[PDB]
Amino acid sequence: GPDQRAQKKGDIILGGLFPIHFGVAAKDQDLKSRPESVECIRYNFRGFRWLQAMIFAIEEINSSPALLPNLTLGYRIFDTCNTVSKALEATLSFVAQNKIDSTIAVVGATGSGVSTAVANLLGLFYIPQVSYASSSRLLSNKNQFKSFLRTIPNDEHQATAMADIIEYFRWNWVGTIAADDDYGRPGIEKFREEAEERDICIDFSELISQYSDEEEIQHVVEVIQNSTAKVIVVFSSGPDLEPLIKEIVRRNITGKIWLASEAWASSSLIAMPQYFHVVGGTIGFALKAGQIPGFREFLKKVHPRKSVHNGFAKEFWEETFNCHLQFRPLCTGDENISSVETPYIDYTHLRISYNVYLAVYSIAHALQDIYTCLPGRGLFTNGSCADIKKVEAWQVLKHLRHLNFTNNMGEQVTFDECGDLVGNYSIINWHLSPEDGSIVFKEVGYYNVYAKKGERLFINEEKILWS
């Protein structure tokens, strides 16, 4: 498969897909010469941290005598660059054996459009796929996506929560903006429905993307400028929102109340001090934080020399310290992760990282249920058991479907009939640090998804800065 990867041999192999870069180099192909492989661009430190959470979980599991005693979990982890084409190249390598007719499960991907394309392929071979971040309602369809599960909740609930917040403040007038993809469009469509139900009037609705040109961006900015709406609901990833926000900042459009979907509510591409005059005071959703003891210390042990199995550690180092590995100064190999602020280690809560950790543990526990299976008490024909020495992916899928374990936070993890894992949301608000000058994500509330109308939303208004 692909050149740059994180790989380690084992008895049972987990595939991994993570956005180590935010995108791909805009060399629009006129096809005058044979297309070359496209270059990934813009290092995603947070994504590398996500990838680390998978490697951490696997090492921790292998270090546990109790969990899967006979066996070692290995891995094969690739960079998607947030792009369907790269994700799919990687995925063709995961199914290489099956297609000729060995990867037993896949953790990923991030964007719902990437996970969809991956799922169409993995589902052919009944290889289970557990996404840590793809939240589109479209992936809940088990007729189309037969092998897909996720440790993040479905956006039906988040979109409803957005309508509930607006109704809570007795607002009645908003604008909407959505990424033109399988995350933004179904999220905002559900929002529209719930908003109409609550007599919230929507003054405009625009689409954006990472690749919107100057005219498209200009048009959206003009719609925003010509509207009396103050509250703008935005369902988008950071990369898809960034070009719009840059232009809004350029024109100094001040005083908007931004309501942020979870994909950009914590995005370092948007939460930048020099945008704060436009973007300050945004209110957004975040998933519930989880804890992973020892993960931060593991993170600080990365090294381009010592990390033999993780071929992304090299570029990570070069990007962090702005150097080149043996004029771009050469890296010493002795520099200090703690001296440079990036999202790699500058975080307070683990959210998506926790979902990654749970995705791996879901797979591991499903395998453990195979290991401990007693004849007659199994899930397959005639109460038969699968053989863990010769496990097939479809058996792991079966076990993932019936999985029920208690996680380190004391919570039961099970997947519903659609492969979804239910969850609540935290509500955060963008403040400026008086110490730091940086944007701080203050928790101001939470949303309890499965409570009765009018008992779901808990907000501490006193904590909100409207700028």
Ligand X SMILES: O=C(O)[C@@H]1Cc2c([nH]c3ccccc23)CN1
Ligand Y SMILES: *[C@@H]1O[C@H](CO)[C@@H](O)[C@H](O)[C@H]1NC(C)=O
Number of residues in the chain: 467
Sheet of strand 201-208: strand arrangement: 201-208, 173-179, 231-235, 257-260, 283-287, 425-432, 439-447, 457-459
Contact map string, positions 394 to 433, toward ligand Y, x by CB under 6 A: ----------x-------x-x-------xxx---------
What lies within 8 Å, CB to CB, of 451 at 6+ separation is none
Q: Which residues of 286-300 are buried (b: 16+ CB within 10 A; e: fewer)?
A: bbbebebeebeeebe
Answer whether 232's CB lies under 8 Å from 174's CB: yes
Q: How many residues bind ligand Y (CB under 6 A)?
A: 17
DSSP code at position 385: -
For residue 132, the surrounding DSSP H or E stretch is none
Kindly identify the residues of this chain, within the stretch 234-253, that bind ligand Y according to CB under 6 A: 252
Site for ligand X in 58-117 (CB under 6 A): 110-112
Q: Is 353 in the site for ligand X (CB under 6 A)?
A: no
Among 41, 92, 330, 409, binds a copy of itself (CB under 8 A): 92
Report in angstroms how near the CB of residue 62 gets to Mg ion at its nearest. 5
Nearer to Cl ion, 33 or 143 (CB): 143
- Cβ closest to ligand Y, residue 172 vs residue 226: 226
Binding to Mg ion (CB under 5 A) within 196-235 occurs at: 205
Q: Residue 120 or residue 438: which is nearer to a copy of itself going by CB?
A: 120
Binding mask 351-390 for a copy of itself (x = CB under 8 A): ----------------------------xxx---------
E strands within 111-158?
129-131, 148-150
- The b/e string for 52-64 (b: 16+ C-beta within 10 A; e otherwise) is bbbbbbbbbbbee
Q: Name which of residues 207 to 246 contact ligand X (CB under 6 A).
A: 237
Residue 147 is labelled as binding a ligand = no
Q: Of 373, 384, 433, 396, nearest to 107 (Cα)?
A: 396
Inter-residue contact 73 to 58 (CB < 8 Å): yes
We find the least distance from the C-beta atom of residue 176 to ligand Y, in angstroms, to be 15
252 binds, among Mg ion, a copy of itself, ligand Y, none (CB under 5 to 8 A by kind): ligand Y
Q: Is 47 annotated as a binding residue?
A: yes
Binding mask 134-173 for a copy of itself (x = CB under 8 A): ---------xx-x---------------------------
Q: Supply the DSSP symbol for 290.
A: B
On whether 79 is known to bind a ligand per the annotation, the reply is no
119 in Cβ contact with 182 (< 8 Å): no
Question: 117: how many CB neighbours lie within 10 A of its CB?
Answer: 19
CA proximity to 242, closest of 282, 287, 277, 208: 208
* 262 marked as binding residue: yes
Spatial separation of the C-alpha atoms in residues 423 and 412, rounded to whole Å = 11
Element (H, E) at 194: helix 184-197
Residues numbered 250 to 269 that lie near ligand Y (CB under 6 A) are 252, 254
Q: Residue from 449, 459, 464, 465 that binds ligand Y (CB under 6 A)? A: 449
Task: Tell whether the torsion through CA atoms of 273, 274, 280 and 282 is positive or negative.
Answer: negative
Spatial CA neighbour of 137 closest among 174, 187, 93, 180: 187
Q: How far is the CB of 285 from ligand Y (least distance, A)?
A: 14
185 annotated among ligand-binding-site residues: no
Minimum CB separation from a copy of itself for residue 35, in Å? 5
**Using CB distances below 5 to 8 A depending on partner kind, what does residue 31 bind out of ligand X, a copy of itself, Cl ion, none?**
a copy of itself
Size of the site for a copy of itself (CB under 8 A): 41
Q: 128 among the known binding-site residues?
A: no
Binding site for Ca(2+): residue ranges?
A: 61, 64, 67-68, 80, 110, 135, 153, 155, 196, 199, 262, 425
> Which positions touch ligand X (CB under 6 A)?
110-112, 133-136, 183, 237, 262-263, 352
> Which positions touch ligand Y (CB under 6 A)?
219, 222-223, 226, 252, 254, 277, 288, 404, 412, 414, 422-424, 448-450
